[PDB]
Amino acid sequence: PMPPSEFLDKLMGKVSGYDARIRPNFKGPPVNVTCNIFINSFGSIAETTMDYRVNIFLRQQWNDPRLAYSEYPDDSLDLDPSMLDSIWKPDLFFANEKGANFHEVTTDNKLLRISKNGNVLYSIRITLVLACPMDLKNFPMDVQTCIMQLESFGYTMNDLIFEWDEKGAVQVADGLTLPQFILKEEKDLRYCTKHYNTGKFTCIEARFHLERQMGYYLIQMYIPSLLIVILSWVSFWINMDAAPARVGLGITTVLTMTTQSSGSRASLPKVSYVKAIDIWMAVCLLFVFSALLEYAAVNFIARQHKELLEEMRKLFISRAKRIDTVSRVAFPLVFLIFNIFYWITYKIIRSED
Amino acid sequence: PMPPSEFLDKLMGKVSGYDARIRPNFKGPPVNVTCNIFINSFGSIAETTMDYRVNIFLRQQWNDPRLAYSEYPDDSLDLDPSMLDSIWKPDLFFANEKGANFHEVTTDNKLLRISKNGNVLYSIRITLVLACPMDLKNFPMDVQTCIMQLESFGYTMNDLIFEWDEKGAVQVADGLTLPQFILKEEKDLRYCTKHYNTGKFTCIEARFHLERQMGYYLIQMYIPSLLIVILSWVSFWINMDAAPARVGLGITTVLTMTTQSSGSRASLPKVSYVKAIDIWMAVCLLFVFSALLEYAAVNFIARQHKELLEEMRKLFISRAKRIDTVSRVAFPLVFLIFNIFYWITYKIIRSED
Amino acid sequence: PMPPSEFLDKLMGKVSGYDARIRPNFKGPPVNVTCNIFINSFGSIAETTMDYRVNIFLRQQWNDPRLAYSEYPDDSLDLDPSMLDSIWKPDLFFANEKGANFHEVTTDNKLLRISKNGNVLYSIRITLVLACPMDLKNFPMDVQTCIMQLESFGYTMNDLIFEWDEKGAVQVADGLTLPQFILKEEKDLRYCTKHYNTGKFTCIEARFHLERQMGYYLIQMYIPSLLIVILSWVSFWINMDAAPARVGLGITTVLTMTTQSSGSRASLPKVSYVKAIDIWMAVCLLFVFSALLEYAAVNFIARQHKELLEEMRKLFISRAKRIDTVSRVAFPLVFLIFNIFYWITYKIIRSED
Amino acid sequence: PMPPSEFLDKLMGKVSGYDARIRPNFKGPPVNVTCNIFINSFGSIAETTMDYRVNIFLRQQWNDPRLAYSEYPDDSLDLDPSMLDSIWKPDLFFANEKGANFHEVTTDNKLLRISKNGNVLYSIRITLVLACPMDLKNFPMDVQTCIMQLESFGYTMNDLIFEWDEKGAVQVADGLTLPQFILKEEKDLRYCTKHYNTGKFTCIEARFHLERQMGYYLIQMYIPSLLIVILSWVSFWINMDAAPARVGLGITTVLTMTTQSSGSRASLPKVSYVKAIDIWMAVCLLFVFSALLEYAAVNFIARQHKELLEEMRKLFISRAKRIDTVSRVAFPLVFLIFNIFYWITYKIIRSED
Amino acid sequence: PMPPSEFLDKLMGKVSGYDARIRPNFKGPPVNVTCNIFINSFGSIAETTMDYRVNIFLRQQWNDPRLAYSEYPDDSLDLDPSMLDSIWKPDLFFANEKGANFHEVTTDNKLLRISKNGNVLYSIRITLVLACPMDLKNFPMDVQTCIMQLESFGYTMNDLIFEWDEKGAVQVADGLTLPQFILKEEKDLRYCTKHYNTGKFTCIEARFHLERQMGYYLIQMYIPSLLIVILSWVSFWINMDAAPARVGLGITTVLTMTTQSSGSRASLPKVSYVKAIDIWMAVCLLFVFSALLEYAAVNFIARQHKELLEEMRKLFISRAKRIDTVSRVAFPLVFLIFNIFYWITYKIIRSED
Ligand SMILES: *[C@@H]1O[C@H](CO)[C@@H](O[C@@H]2O[C@H](CO)[C@@H](O)[C@H](O)[C@H]2NC(C)=O)[C@H](O)[C@H]1NC(C)=O
Numbered sequence A, B, C, D, E: 001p002m003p004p005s006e007f008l009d010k011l012m013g014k015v016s017g018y019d020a021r022i023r024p025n026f027k028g029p030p031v032n033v034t035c036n037i038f039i040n041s042f043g044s045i046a047e048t049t050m051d052y053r054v055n056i057f058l059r060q061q062w063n064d065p066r067l068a069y070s071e072y073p074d075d076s077l078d079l080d081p082s083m084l085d086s087i088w089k090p091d092l093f094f095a096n097e098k099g100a101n102f103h104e105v106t107t108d109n110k111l112l113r114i115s116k117n118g119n120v121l122y123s124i125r126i127t128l129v130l131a132c133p134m135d136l137k138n139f140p141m142d143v144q145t146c147i148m149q150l151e152s153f154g155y156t157m158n159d160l161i162f163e164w165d166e167k168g169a170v171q172v173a174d175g176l177t178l179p180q181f182i183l184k185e186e187k188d189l190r191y192c193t194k195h196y197n198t199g200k201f202t203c204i205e206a207r208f209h210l211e212r213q214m215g216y217y218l219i220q221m222y223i224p225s226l227l228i229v230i231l232s233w234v235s236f237w238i239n240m241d242a243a244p245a246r247v248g249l250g251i252t253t254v255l256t257m258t259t260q261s262s263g264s265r266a267s268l269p270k271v272s273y274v275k276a277i278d279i280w281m282a283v284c285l286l287f288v289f290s291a292l293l294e295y296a297a298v299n300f301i302a303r304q305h306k307e308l309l310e311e312m313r314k315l316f317i318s319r320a321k322r323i324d325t326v327s328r329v330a331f332p333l334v335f336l337i338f339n340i341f342y343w344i345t346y347k348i349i350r351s352e353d
């Protein structure tokens, strides 16, 4: 029954005592802010610069003793999004940020609801490039935790205290998949605090859990390396008399192992601690290098026989045959038990982390 | 007959009851928005980050009971584009966005038309970087669907409902070609809806269909691999006595197949599910590896004959000749039937998707 | 004799009837805009994303029946560049754009002149990243045409019509050279038109012509490939008895041809139609592959002779010598006539396009 | 007891004599600014463009004779962050900058405190891309110093003088680690000054110390090179009669050393002075090249014996055996004493810098 | 003695006749602007896109007949940097620009001084990405000249004329070094002019001189190539009987020369004119190719002897020995005189440019 313009002008205006630069219920208890997180599109995680791009909606609810009309017959009112510089929006920033621009397509992407009691709604979609300090102890499994710290800036703990919600904590979009990782539906959340030299500031956070969807690294690194140890066993199944071919084969296998190994760490950023992949590459490289060394020893034994050329002649030839046959038998069992030990210790550490 | 300035000042002014912060025909039925899409320049699709750049014009028409002059002798009026903060433009955003800036060259790229009844026009060219979740089950064919979701932000389903148009749905520019794909002239379109925890919001979308213009991947991957299996058949047409040359040829072919294979997946982003190209590379690699293995077996048989050096001698030589000739015959027929089976199953799946 | 401030305040002010939001000589004939283009710095053309960066000055002249003082003793007046929001600048955009920011260093880069009759001047330097749909039928020659479409946005053909100039059409900077291309001094220009669903809009364009300054591609691709066919002729001038060396040489040449070929298309964006360079690479690859095949055939003939080891013995040896000598003679003449045919068909198509 | 709005309006208003465009206690002594630095997230250092990204909080305190209410019962007051254009914030810039944008997420990231005496607080989080002129005399150790120069712009030394703090100088975040370097807890700090042609300006700086967390460069460069000298010693443990194999092995090792060496300097920017890594690569390359040269000399001696083929025959064979055995003994001791000398001179220079 | 606010309000205000939109001493002589350049941080020159990043301070002084208080006892006054839209700053732009943003960290980076006579100061730090058309006739020496053209925009030669200074022309920062180049302390400067179709505009410029600090290109390109010609001389010091090894060595050296050569031009942008480095690579490639050719000729001579196998036999063997020994002697003297001729013509052209 009353004109909409008149109601809007009177409320949050200059003819009333509403001042947008001061905290409501001044000089008393702090105001509680209830935040909810709707993840719109997770993805584009950078593993070389330790960051990821995510756009949240950041809806926050609080109560004020003012702006309580209590005269309209409905429960809540929808206000226009171009009158947000008089609603006293609270302060909120992220402790790990890079850029973090707004969204201004067609019209401003703000929202502002107001009810009879004073519980408001304020959600703004913002694209964040949050930096996460991921620890990469083992590269193939790569269990990871990503955070974000909602924290005030200029309002202490005894001035403004933030809180989470109970009906739903962190919501995700329906049908949201990632090509690198998969999202865990546990959504571990708690909150820390900050102690600077100016006062005690609140800082609420939330943790995510992302594990690697295996199958890429098996074809890029594990499958080619296997085709190299089989190549060295192929060098074991060849005639000893021929010097050119064998030598070339051993050398070529070693070179490929080095190139591959190198190229495997290119995507990864410079790190000091040895990785799981490095251990695998070193073991393979050792096997191929050992094969080459075994050939040099056999060649030397045969050469010694040639230089000294009855019973010792046959003994040397027999020794060369025996070492080659025992190397052909011994090499796949040690590699198979290394493969079994390696995958069983990494599957139990994948279950344990 | 009446002064233009006076008419402009009176309409959408402060001496009248027009308030730009409130929805027209308040507390009643919702207002319908009729949207049209003119694609100006499609292209620059990113296959490694799953996005594409497109600039639409976004013309939207709606009706209001106000701004109905009904006193000028013409049907419609052209207003200046610097008076858009009083025309109550509705809210519209895209659910998949990255950046999405405006266009401000020379003068603002807005448009605003107004007729006697109140049907307005509002088109703004905006460059969008829309993220599309493309599924790459088979890489060479790469059938793809790209979308965009027009959705309100702050107006529920019972407050503002969007709709499409009937005279033309999504228009494209005349003579618009893409180097990677080709545009399908079907333009499949329908609309979903959104259900958040704050209310029911409308969400209108449109789907495109882009198929790969084949001919690039045939020269980059298929043509070189063929020149590798012919190389292994060349190794089959060589004398068995010579150990260096053959060994080197087999090894070299295998190495090229691995390098090529690796480099072929560099453009593609990290994915878990095996691709069609990977299957082709594996089959080729297997053929060349098998050739190498066949040579090792022949070499071993010949060596056995050498170590034991009448009727068994001839039998061993005959066996070596027989295995080489049957391998030279058997290898191109298995590769030819694999090529026929591979291309016929991919052409029937290209017709089926 | 009259105060400058008073004259400025009265003209394009609120005490006069000048309204900046309305077109001059309203409800009558359209106003003609005379545009000139001064290219400041052409360059930075992107061949992988089909675009180029150019900064024009965009001076445009038009006439209005208002702003005709006719009281100062000079012909024209220079106004300050911070009073451009009251001069009714017309609308102009480009149909192919990416970014296209302004220039704001020290002071605004605008210009505004006004004469006694009303012919104004308005030039603004803007850096444009225009997208051009270049067709690359033949890569080395790469004849190209680049455009830019000046078009209004909100003013129809019967409301505002653009035109070019007659004293000079498109000016270039003195001493402007490009490292990739060279500018043609013809400057072909004409104008198209646009027909959308809202009305008939004017669209004026201009075409440039850029041809490749040859000498880069001759050293990067043509010179190394020649040094590969000479390498295969070197393999032809070697003894047939030696199996290792020859085989290795043939294989190595083939591998280099493949690597080179691959790497040559890296700069170029993904395209479907076969290029001129690809044809050259294929022909060279065929020659080297053929050489390898020729060796395998000779080796096989010699091996047959070895297995059967009087008159047929000499005949086989003679045949091996004859095939090698005829291959050594036949191979440079076919390659020389291919080189002559290839360069004469590309020089006549370079003269014809 | 007094209304908050009235107090805010009167203070830093137009009804009082507070002018925000003039320095407090004008025409007298300069005002001292006490700055503190809280490092929020150090990291993303660029070693190829000599820069690093760091976000500081920049809290600065100063005193003014105005804004001394002395009427509220508390010690300090918290003001709103949207009234900062009337508090006369001082001027501060950085002498080495690239970009250096602000932070505007949800609400402005400013802070403003005011006490009864007039000591204010003003902290703003700003992401800085500071350029540091790092000297890379030795690449593996890479001891580095990073700075930042806080300096005024428009206020001379006798007008505004900056100072540091005594209770804490430069604070770091709790649990801040870097993947490339490690932060030194000394935090060396002092201050320089500037003398331009316009006056004497103050310039306060702070220096950091970052040393390389070793373990990356040991696996990427040192470990593969060792596996190359062992490869050349493998070539020393092979029969001299065989010419193909040995030659190939020597050549292959030399080629890998060159490729590796090249690729090792790719990350590093173009520099003129020789690096420590280059010295190591050159020494290794020399050892492998020397091995190859040793083989050529032995081959030549054996060939001479072949061409001349009693007592000199045996003497030549004996000489070939003696040179090979003495090269097999002499080569690992010279490489081991080079390794000992190299690591002991670099560990004493790592302790000395 | 007079209030600072009153003086500031009266001067450059609306109660006086000062108009910021008009040139001082109107309709008379032009105003002279004295510019000085302080280079803060030179560096980050791009050799592939022909540009460089430099931040200047751009202090400019001019005189006006207005703003002459002549009532304060000091010589000059310091004004606040937030009142620059009323001081009539002149127009200045750069003819070669890319981006060229401002600097806004903490407070605006402007400066404004005003004396009793009217000589003002105005310095603004701006980061410029100036495009320079460098000519690369010889790549290792790479003598270069970089410019920047200060020019007005909207004020003709008879309206506003710019000038340089006499006490210092272009100042550099103390201790400013570059990793790629070194700065010449000559600072050649003069000024051109512009003649467009609208009038005569002033354009003042300054030229820098940057020469290459040699030592990078000697290790990346010159040192590896030498280790390739020594490798071909190693192939000359080997036994002719062995066909595999030699052939492989020749081929490998040629391949490395090609790969290296290619990779050397990767950093450089596409250019047509042959470079000095290309000439060096071609000469080296020719020497290694020639060595390979020499071997083929010797092999052919030996083969001819084998096919014909008394006095001609010895003569052929003697000829093979003579050609090998004369090639081993002749090859290092031609390469040494080429090295001497090459470095003496480039050191005299380095002294001449
Ligand atoms: C939400 O705010 C209310 C007041 O605005 C807080 O209630 C006060 O909390 C303190 C600490 O427990 C008590 O000493 C007061 O007596 C409470 N006030 C009243 C009126 O009961 C409340 O703690 C806040 N909620 C949370 C979760 O902290």
Ligand SMILES: *[C@@H]1O[C@H](CO)[C@@H](O[C@@H]2O[C@H](CO)[C@@H](O)[C@H](O)[C@H]2NC(C)=O)[C@H](O)[C@H]1NC(C)=O
Residues within 6 Å of the ligand: B029, B030, B031, B032, B161, B163
């Ligand atoms: C366009 O808007 C009109 C009203 O503005 C809608 O018409 C109403 O629709 C509801 C639902 O069907 C009916 O119950 C009402 O009776 C309609 N009003 C009238 C006056 O007839 C209409 O539905 C909208 N168009 C679309 C496609 O939804």
Ligand SMILES: *[C@@H]1O[C@H](CO)[C@@H](O[C@@H]2O[C@H](CO)[C@@H](O)[C@H](O)[C@H]2NC(C)=O)[C@H](O)[C@H]1NC(C)=O
Residues within 6 Å of the ligand: C029, C030, C031, C032, C161, C163
């Ligand atoms: C420039 O504008 C004038 C009017 O502003 C145009 O002149 C009119 O053109 C139409 C079409 O030929 C004629 O029917 C009218 O009679 C013309 N008016 C007058 C007063 O002669 C003119 O065509 C425009 N110039 C161009 C090149 O289109």
Ligand SMILES: *[C@@H]1O[C@H](CO)[C@@H](O[C@@H]2O[C@H](CO)[C@@H](O)[C@H](O)[C@H]2NC(C)=O)[C@H](O)[C@H]1NC(C)=O
Residues within 6 Å of the ligand: D029, D030, D031, D032, D161, D163
């Ligand atoms: C802080 O500021 C005060 C004044 O605002 C400075 O005190 C003056 O310093 C000069 C130089 O030593 C003396 O000659 C004056 O007598 C001092 N004034 C008074 C009232 O004592 C002080 O130096 C500044 N602090 C620092 C560290 O420079």
Ligand SMILES: *[C@@H]1O[C@H](CO)[C@@H](O[C@@H]2O[C@H](CO)[C@@H](O)[C@H](O)[C@H]2NC(C)=O)[C@H](O)[C@H]1NC(C)=O
Residues within 6 Å of the ligand: E029, E030, E031, E032, E161, E163
């Ligand atoms: C600086 O400006 C003054 C005037 O503002 C210029 O002086 C005039 O120059 C012209 C050309 O030489 C003479 O014809 C006038 O007579 C000069 N005026 C006076 C009052 O002497 C002066 O040329 C400018 N400086 C420079 C270097 O051009």
